[PDB]
Amino acid sequence: CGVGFIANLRGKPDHTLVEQALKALGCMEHRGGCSADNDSGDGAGVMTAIPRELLAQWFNTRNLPMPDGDRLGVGMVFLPQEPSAREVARAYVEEVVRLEKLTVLGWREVPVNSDVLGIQAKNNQPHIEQILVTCPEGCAGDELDRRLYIARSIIGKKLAEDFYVCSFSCRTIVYKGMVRSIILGEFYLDLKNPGYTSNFAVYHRRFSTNTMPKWPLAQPMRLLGHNGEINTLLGNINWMAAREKELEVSGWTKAELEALTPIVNQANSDSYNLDSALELLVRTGRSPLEAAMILVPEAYKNQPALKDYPEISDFHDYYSGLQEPWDGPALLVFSDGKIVGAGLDRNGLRPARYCITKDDYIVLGSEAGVVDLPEVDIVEKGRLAPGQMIAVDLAEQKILKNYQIKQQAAQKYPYGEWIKIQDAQTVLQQQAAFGYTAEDVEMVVVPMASQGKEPTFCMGDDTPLAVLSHKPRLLYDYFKQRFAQVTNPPIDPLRENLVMSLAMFLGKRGNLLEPKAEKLRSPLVNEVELQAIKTGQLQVAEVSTLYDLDGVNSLEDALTNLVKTAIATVQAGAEILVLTDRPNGAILTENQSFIPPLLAVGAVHHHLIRAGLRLKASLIVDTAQCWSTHHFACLVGYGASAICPYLALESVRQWWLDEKTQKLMENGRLDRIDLPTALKNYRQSVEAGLFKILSKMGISLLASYHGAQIFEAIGLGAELVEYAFAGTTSRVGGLTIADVAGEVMVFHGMAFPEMAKKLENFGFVNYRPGGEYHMNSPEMSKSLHKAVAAYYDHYELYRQYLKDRPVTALRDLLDFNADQPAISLEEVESVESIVKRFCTGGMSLGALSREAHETLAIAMNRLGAKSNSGEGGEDVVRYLTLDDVDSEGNSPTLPHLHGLQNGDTANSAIKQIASGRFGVTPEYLMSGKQLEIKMAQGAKPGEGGQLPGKKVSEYIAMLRRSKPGVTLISPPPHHDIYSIEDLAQLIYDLHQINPEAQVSVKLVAEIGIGTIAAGVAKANADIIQISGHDGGTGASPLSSIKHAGSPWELGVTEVHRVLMENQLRDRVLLRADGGLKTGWDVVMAALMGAEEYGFGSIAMIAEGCIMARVCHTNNCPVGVATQQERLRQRFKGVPGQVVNFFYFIAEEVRSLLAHLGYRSLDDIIGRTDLLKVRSDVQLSKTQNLTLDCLLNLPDTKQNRQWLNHEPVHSNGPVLDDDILADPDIQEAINHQTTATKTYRLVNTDRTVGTRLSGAIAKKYGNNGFEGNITLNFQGAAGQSFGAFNLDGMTLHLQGEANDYVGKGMNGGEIVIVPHPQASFAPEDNVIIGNTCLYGATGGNLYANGRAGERFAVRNSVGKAVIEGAGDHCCEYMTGGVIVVLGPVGRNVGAGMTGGLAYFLDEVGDLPEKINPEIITLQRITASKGEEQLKSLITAHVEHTGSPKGKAILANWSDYLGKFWQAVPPSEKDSPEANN
């Protein structure tokens, strides 16, 4: 979406503002969507003051007295088109306007031209009419809106697509519709009418994830236009729904309050919901500025900027306990009529550029160059740093974040004033019965307790889903974590920890509305805090999670009674309910089992909610059954305010406090482990675990996580889910209450009536004889491998291992119900034809050895299929078909390879773009028949690439332009994709640089992917990849292998269906991958909707993976997943083998086609109706699963057109296209020429210069050009200005630019200069936006002005001088040189692992801001460092004329001192940080 305001202080309501808003909305177009029409908009809107002039002709024509300003008030109302319904409708507005003692003057029919609307909008269009109202008693301003508020709210009880109040106030009015932006003015005529005048305008342009517009949903709403995504919806909506009965405010009556009856409802959008919520705060006597602060608070903690402001730090300290953030990104813009303003989510996830004139004329908005002010008279050009607000007040004054936040610092204060004033070894079988397991303590608790980090591991979760498996499992194992993909971002929880927190308030929340004077550092509370708390504010009913045998018979009762016990205790004044399965001190054989703590914390949490009471107490879950990082998250997630994992905590104790261990600690394991460190380690490793899980969905605060329920349950039954975990999706739906009970009996069986010596081992993490199944195992793959080595019994073996398996995935419940007679293999399409649908699927040159990697690519190129360049670049030598192949099968070009033929090519068909952008280079981008945006991987959704240092050899270092020693933990998000629109920019950047190349976007299955996919389709992609939770990794956390992601049967299905219903299905080809290994897997994916098929792990196997499963270790015995030369030598493996393996898999498909009876996989895809539920299968745990989610897809028997895609989506006529047009193709093809060109840019001009880089690149690779094209520009640059810029390419920006300047930059120069006519101080004044220089690989960028957040995020080799910046300066930086001549946000070094950065920070405070975790703060001391800073502080002045630049130069001797230098230990010993 695009959002913005324009405000006018020192004029009176002109019509030009109104024109300006509309124009501006115009340049938001590329930020919004279109419906199936490609014509109707996902929405456009505008808030203004009542255009009291224009309405003057209404009263006039009717011969009526127009009421005062504050006493008119105007309902802008959408209404049914059918006349009789239109009247029914209108009689009601009036009924209820009447029913507050107000009076109707009548109604103005809103002049409109329906002819401009696209067909779908037009079919939808409500009939649109303004009701004009007044109050006889003499009500005005605040009381009248307050009353109207009550009225639009009552009218809101009957909300309909056909019946909806856009706005009803005496102060503000909304004109909106399902129109493309520049059409908004053509539809509504009022807006093009010079009697239309307003002191301001809030404008919004919508981008939806569907294709069926509903008019109410366009969006500047009643109070705000929101651009962003609440990523905690469900929680927030629950903690508001609970606030709802007990509202109290000043003379607000219990009858008026009750009238906003449900002010929040999960059926509406975060937006409607946010507006609503923020309304209730405003109409109840806070200004929208304050109400935003309560609801979308900055990250105050650690905030240098709050040194002089401790009042504000206390209002959050306060509000922090009361109201948890509405998280996710957000640029919020809102008006009261009294105030108009804007501010950001705590993270600054949306751009917000403002502009101010000598006459305090302001212009805020998503994009800089938008309303066009007369440059000469610009006073300030700024932006909102994270959490910053900026406003305007009718008393003619603008209002920057400081006053502002202080102004409600100041009042209702008690702030800080009141804040102040507020033995045997039964363990061995407790453990057993609670469900611990040999692998749980040995492979999980132990490592946390010993190293302080939950374990790393490798490969995919091979094993069946909790519900279909035959081995005991925890209830936790049914909940898969959800995570952010395109539609919002993850946050980096280690590099941006400073913004997170695990605080968790144990008091009861009161009135949000009534600020009266009248805490737990982490959720994990140790025995000490348990007592401490059990002293504390209130007394605290233990409620037996326990229950005796036979009498109270079943698990069902003890639930019924726990909740009743809970309900009852909370009424009786209990303000904390500690639910112990350890009540009064012990857990017997005949305490004959438990309530599972997840079940309990769910039940009491939803049943309290159901009781009006959830707000009264707050819950501690005191359980043995919690040890996992994921366990803790299930618990907080479904309600726990905190947790005391007493047995977990015990298991550290026994393990350390044991002879075996203490011994090895005397020599072997680390004896740096007094017990105080083992425990402080165990927890401290749980804390990093929670930070992680939240960051997977982009959530900063356990506080927010704590309502929400950021999970999808696979295999829980409908009743089970409502009773305990309400409103969680569970589409396959298995277990019942008794069913869970039976499982808890399975491992209670085994600690008690029997014996106890060591907890059982089922091979969950790793293949065992005794234990859980695994789609891949070392003996299984040894033989598959020997099969492909030849050209046989090994399939009898390999195929057999594949028969032996239980139920593992959802496809296993299905089977074929052919609708046509069996057919003949010779009619089926050839093996060569299928093979072209196969994809090796991208595993990183880091992670695999180049031997294994180049091999997949040569084999995949052979079959005429595709291979994928994981995430770690590609060696340029591969981009060349091979000449030199000799008799023996070898090539001097690739000596390490074997079995090569003369036409082979090791070049990846697909080039991956991932968060680190490691090899991401114009030629890279150009050697690629397709490009892949890696939103996420199966093994680890909300998380970045991971490559341990062990494995970062000089080769890799060189490839990634990063440092030899060092570990590569990529950023969770692309710093580049904070929203769907943002996605569309990267897709566009990439279609821009390689028009030829299809762009896929890779997403993991989870509920929500279908909506998201709809977005990716509208965002202009060519391919979407669904990856199951199944898939492999050469490294991930084990938690994530086993707990994040959902089956791809869910993914593919859901995307296929949504795509079809939204009529976007032709737009895109779908890849499915994750755990495919067999033709029947291909046929299952195909029926389910997939057109290509991806193979990682197996492809590896077929080259000679055993399943050592030591991938993240750099030990592959077998030469595949290592960088060790020794091991690499032992790589057996030739292209022929994988080539053959996919000939098998294809053959095997051809014959399924035969039993089924079609010629061509083209005939089966999404013929979901060919599937039926299997007759044999019975599982251990429930009677059955509901498979509606997989069987019920769009009939595809005749509608198969969607299966025809355009060869590649285009970016459109684009300015580069012309650039590339003039005498210009002579400066390229004549390898050396100067050319100059000059152009106006407007901010629709995006990625400019980029196509021409690709142009040169495609012919001279990155460094072969000696020409000198100088393109000079003027205006406001759109997104990605000067991306992927090459050598011999100079770009002048006369003006300003937006976000992503220099993205990808490889080579050459980008100079950006304010327009000369500015009377402002360049250095004090912003000129470039967020994430500039992202993954820069060469180049130098010179810019006269503050830049955005993330400056030079993943900068690998680019250089730059800018004059100031926001937060995260130099984020994951890794080489090159960055020079900043002005202030800079906090976190000023996060994970910057290589390269030099020089600041100049005169407030002296910089050291407080800097991220101290790896970078070190020096004073320039090396005289070769000065020689570095002066060259660039000079070069800047040469290219610009810089006013802070020139200053520093002829006062060189002075400024040089107090002014720091950033060194990574990595550069400690270079001729520029030493001597």
Ligand SMILES: Cc1cc2nc3c(=O)[nH]c(=O)nc-3n(C[C@H](O)[C@H](O)[C@H](O)COP(=O)(O)O)c2cc1C
């Ligand atoms: C060794 C290894 C490295 C991988 N590297 C990447 C990576 O660089 N980027 C990515 O998106 N997926 C990566 N993956 C996942 C694959 O792209 C693919 O999604 C997955 O391996 C398919 O699941 P499967 O192993 O069950 O076939 C990797 C997987 C493994 C086995």
Ligand SMILES: O=C(O)CCC(=O)C(=O)O
């Ligand atoms: O090679 C990398 O940069 C990381 C790839 C990854 O996370 C994986 O191997 O699963």
Ligand code: F3S
């Ligand atoms: S599991 Fe991995 S460590 Fe080796 S044998 Fe396979 S590549």
